[PDB]
């Protein structure tokens, strides 16, 4: 692929093939809490996911994804800034090379060790993910900052699955899993209009960033980093990091629900 996270093909370089990299609505961002606007029009976030929609886990080379069946509204996000319900299609993580960075969003400059993204597409307005992905109101992503500390037992099925998808392109069934079990117990959030955080970088995402972090151990983060970006048979190339730097707000307002 034309892009990665390496020195040559990584975030610093994306704008060459994806000029939107320098756009006005790029993600992730640093959330400065003294510049947020508390907003009473927001509703609470409501997730209702059906574990029967979990489908597959797959190694996509720069990361791994857990995908869900998205042919109907069995698993949905509602509330917050939204009037439409958004259909779950995937979750995945971002991490860094050491515990000291790795999240995509930061809060008052503080970097967390990893970030969970639970991604959804607007099935009220669009008929598929590929249609929704380029639309300003097409995607809703919950970002959960992950703070290195106590092992998180809720990650267990995900981590136990990685041994079946060690190298790029490997897929496996991943069933009977409700990813709302990964969310923090408080769903207070910030929201802002932004983008996908890697190519094609479309400015189609309403971000929902949880105020409360969830934990992850140093050894759990190691399991992410020991996934391999090469295909089976080649020299092992671990996936050490896949977070993008924070981008300029360019005048957007981050709103707080709390
Ligand atoms: N890290 S993220 O949550 O911002 C994110 C995402 F959720 C996506 F679905 C995609 N897409 C989905 C639409 C087409 C393929 C890639 C993407 F690029 C991406 F960066
Ligand atoms: Zn992501």
Curated annotation (Swiss-Prot):
Assigned keywords, A-Z: Acetylation, Cytoplasm, Lyase, Metal-binding, Zinc
Pfam families linked: Carb_anhydrase
EC number in record: 4.2.1.1, 4.2.1.69
Catalytic activity: hydrogencarbonate + H(+) = CO2 + H2O; urea = cyanamide + H2O
Principal EC category: lyase
GO cellular component, one term: cytoplasm
Residues holding Zn(2+) 2: 62, 65, 198
Gene Ontology molecular function: arylesterase activity; carbonate dehydratase activity; cyanamide hydratase activity; hydro-lyase activity; zinc ion binding
Residues binding Zn(2+) 1: 92, 94, 117
Location within or outside the cell: Cytoplasm
Alphabetized SMART domains for the sequence: Carb_anhydrase
Active-site residues, record numbering mapped to chain: 62
Cofactor: Zn(2+)
Activity control: Activated by histamine, imidazole, L-adrenaline, L- and D-histidine, and L- and D-phenylalanine. Inhibited by coumarins, sulfonamide derivatives such as acetazolamide, benzenesulfonamide and derivatives (4-carboxyethylbenzene-sulfonamide, 4-carboxyethylbenzene-sulfonamide ethyl ester, 4-(acetyl-2-aminoethyl)benzene-sulfonamide, 4-aminoethylbenzene-sulfonamide), and 'prong inhibitors' BR15, BR17, BR22 and BR30. Activated by a short exposition to Foscarnet (phosphonoformate trisodium salt), but inhibited by a long one. Esterase activity weakly reduced by cyanamide.
Domain Alpha-carbonic anhydrase, chain residue ranges per copy: 1-258
Superkingdom classification of source: Eukaryota
Residues the record lists as binding substrate: 197-198
Region described as Disordered: spans on this chain: 1-28, 238-258
Chief location bin: cytoplasm
Function as written in the Swiss-Prot or TrEMBL entry: Catalyzes the reversible hydration of carbon dioxide. Can hydrate cyanamide to urea.
Assigned protein family: Belongs to the alpha-carbonic anhydrase family.
Name by which UniProt lists this protein: Carbonic anhydrase 1
UniProt source species: Homo sapiens (Human)
Record gene name: CA1
